[PDB]
Amino acid sequence: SMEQVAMELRLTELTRLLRSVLDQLQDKDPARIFAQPVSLKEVPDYLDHIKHPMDFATMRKRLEAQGYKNLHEFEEDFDLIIDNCMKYNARDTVFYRAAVRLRDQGGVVLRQARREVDSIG
């Protein structure tokens, strides 16, 4: 149908906007602490602590399969990156601190993303 195509074009354009958002958030992680999944070879107990691991490469895979239907789903995944880290790592660690800085800096980007998603529909 023509409607299915129109819906698909909307999803494609959301994917375009989310790709730009993801790039801007990942720039706020210059140490690449959140770039890849936590290694279960190096942290063998991780899944005993964290039930839904997340990282920027995993988000990118979902994004490129057009797997985010809306901004809320994408933000859920970004929040998991931060929240998982702040639980597993203590306050005095470079990992925790990196997450706080990512959260604070990402808030600005996500604030305008939400306006753009609503604005452009």
UniProtKB/Swiss-Prot annotation:
Superkingdom assignment: Eukaryota
Cross-link (Glycyl lysine isopeptide (Lys-Gly) (interchain with G-Cter in SUMO2)): K41
Boundaries of every Bromo domain copy: 9-113
Cellular location(s): Nucleus; Chromosome
Tissue expression per record: Highly expressed in testis.
Assembly and interaction partners: Component of some HBO1 complex composed of KAT7/HBO1, MEAF6, ING4 and BRD1/BRPF2. Component of the MOZ/MORF complex composed at least of ING5, KAT6A, KAT6B, MEAF6 and one of BRPF1, BRD1/BRPF2 and BRPF3. Interacts (via PHD-type zinc finger domain) with unmodified histone H3. Interacts (via PWWP domain) with dimethylated and trimethylated 'Lys-79' on histone H3.
Function recorded in the entry: Scaffold subunit of various histone acetyltransferase (HAT) complexes, such as the MOZ/MORF and HBO1 complexes, that acts as a regulator of hematopoiesis. Plays a key role in HBO1 complex by directing KAT7/HBO1 specificity towards histone H3 'Lys-14' acetylation (H3K14ac), thereby promoting erythroid differentiation.
Protein name: Bromodomain-containing protein 1
Species classification: Eukaryota, Metazoa, Chordata, Craniata, Vertebrata
Gene name linked to the record: BRD1
